[PDB]
Amino acid sequence: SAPVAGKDFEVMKSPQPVSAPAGKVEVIEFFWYGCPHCYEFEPTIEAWVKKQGDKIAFKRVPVAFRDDFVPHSKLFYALAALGVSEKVTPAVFNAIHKEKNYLLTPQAQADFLATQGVDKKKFLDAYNSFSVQGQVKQSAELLKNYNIDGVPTIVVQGKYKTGPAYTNSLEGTAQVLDFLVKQVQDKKL
């Protein structure tokens, strides 16, 4: 059955500006390294994004629901600043969820990433950079702008939100996302 508006996805009363160009559908994944659903969803969203390719503009935004997890948002943007996000991120998820290493401090992050081939000094310089600080503050602003209260949350074209909170299953989130993107492409949404 086709997804329904209000149950399987939410039409934001205040849509946000989309960064994707014309011809591409913007897809934003609000996630948290420590959220088990986000870890469980990673392979699904990765494959789906790669399959879509030039049809979408995918980005992730880290979420720090409490102050304790701001270091995870700094980690996200620090890995991006170093250009090693795609490579070491699976090890980051594994460290948090399977090795009981929650990577909650810059030092623990640096040590672990050192075991993954990342120079401690370069990573810490990125972690404490003003640019990463600004990106983290911006990610909090976006959490507010999109009215995100849970993760993982998928936002399509800055207007339609979905996720396991709406679909009760990660597969359901994927199916709704694919539907939403295709609806936007056909100009039906």
Author numbering: 9 to 197
Sentences reproduced from the published study:
DsbA works in tandem with its membrane-embedded partner protein DsbB, which is required to maintain DsbA in its active, oxidized state. Binding was characterized using NMR and X-ray crystallo­graphy. Both 1 and 2 bind to a transient (or ‘cryptic’) pocket on BpsDsbA located adjacent to the redox active site which is not observed in the apo BpsDsbA structure.
A crystal was harvested and diffracted to a resolution of 2.3 Å with space group P21 and unit-cell parameters a = 69.4, b = 59.4 , c = 105.4 Å, α = γ = 90, β = 104.9°. The two orientations A and B of fragment 2 sit in an almost completely closed pocket at the interface of protein chains A and B.
